[PDB]
Symmetry: D3
Subunit: 47 residues, 6 copies
């Protein structure tokens, strides 16, 4: 039925977005934690 | 005092990342439950 | 259907606990790892 | 440096347990969820 | 030093591959578990 | 017997997915420990 295959297509999309999401959010954590490491690096040519 | 502040921002970031992936996970789980719960209803209707 | 809804009540309940156990852990490993880095700082402060 | 290596011994040890606790959980939620689906099958078999 | 920034670039790459990895592997789980759901769907126009 | 077999393959898949993300995680953690452990050594050398 177009229906079950409708809902599975919503389900499939719900999961798609949910990886884009979790991948943006993790790409973010790493930027944040990258930034801070790379700053600290600078506070070491200066130690 | 500086080091201690980098490790503040690094703990802020992680927490913020922890808070964020726990939103994504609760939103996909909503969605999927909707679709499930719509299955169940279009089902008493088979 | 009471019974289909009971069960999904169960499915959902597991998923909480499951995801709720997954924070607990994550929080433990960032604690263990927090103290470590934090001791690396003290011992470094006596470089 | 014994002490730097001690600590990393610790860091690594946490990471095991952490990641080792994360399987335990994952295994619990697929168990709970296993039984559920599996009961949905029985109750369906009396459709 | 080119060195610390060397190693961070390895570190950055180690993590990059480690997302490609974990994303292939999950894209796989879903295909596998997609396939099986969509098969079962077919065994229902036939129930 | 069929249903029971789909739920066999579905449990096979998950396990295989569980086994696989636990390789990726142990390989990135190797790598990163190498880089860390190379830091530590190029460090007694500051
Ligand atoms: Zn990306
Ligand atoms: Zn660095
Ligand atoms: Zn620190
Ligand atoms: Zn929540
Ligand atoms: Zn249901
Ligand atoms: Zn918490
Ligand atoms: Zn070390
Ligand atoms: Zn296991
Ligand atoms: Zn992809
Ligand atoms: Zn379907
Ligand atoms: Zn089944
Ligand atoms: Zn392992």
């Amino acid at each position: 039925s177009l229906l079950e295959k409708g809902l599975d297509g919503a389900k499939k999309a719900v999961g798609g977005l949910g990886k884009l999401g979790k991948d943006a959010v993790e790409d973010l954590e790493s930027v944040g934690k990258g930034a801070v490491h790379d700053v600290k690096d600078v506070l070491d040519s200066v130690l």
